[PDB]
């Protein structure tokens, strides 16, 4: 479950709650996905999970208030290309990748701003690699 979001190893993981490495072919081939460059990972991360994506967005402009720079995201989902698209359409300097932005989303999500701190807190509990982010 902590792998299932924000680890980039879900497709490489032999077990997805009991699931082998597939699902990537067909529906993505029926209509080609216009994204690439770790397109699998954003299908998995908490900012890329459609229901949890907007919860990060609700965190995002709370983080934006925390960072004192306000700007509206293009979509309710946060991933690699959308953040680049959001960049190319006014914000803090020093971060330009989605890896650190998801970090700043998650630590604020680990604050009692939404009742779904439980997911963010559990992610930082395991593993020890995620513990240092908190």
């Amino acid at each position: 479950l902590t792998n299932y979001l924000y680890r980039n190893k879900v497709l490489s993981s032999k077990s997805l709650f009991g699931v082998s490495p597939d699902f990537f072919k067909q529906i993505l081939e029926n209509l080609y996905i216009p994204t690439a460059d770790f397109k699998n990972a954003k299908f998995f991360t908490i900012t890329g999970i459609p229901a949890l994506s907007y919860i990060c967005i609700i965190i995002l402009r709370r983080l934006e208030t925390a960072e004192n720079t306000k700007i509206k995201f293009t979509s309710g989902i946060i991933n690699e290309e959308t953040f680049n698209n959001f960049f190319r359409v006014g914000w803090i300097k020093g971060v330009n990748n989605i890896h650190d932005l998801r970090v700043k989303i998650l630590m604020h999500l680990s604050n009692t701003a939404n009742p779904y701190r439980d997911i963010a807190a559990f992610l930082f509990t395991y593993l020890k690699s995620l513990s240092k982010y908190s």
Binding site: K25, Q26, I27, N30, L31
Partner: peptide, 29 residues
């Protein structure tokens, strides 16, 4: 796009109606 599932799936079924516009139009009505 003729198959909603893998080629190993479409072996049991048949995408002939999706491939053929005549059957595609006949099935709609």
């Amino acid at each position: 796009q003729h198959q909603m599932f893998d080629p190993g799936v479409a072996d049991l079924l048949d995408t002939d109606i999706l491939t053929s516009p005549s059957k595609r139009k006949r099935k709609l009505k």
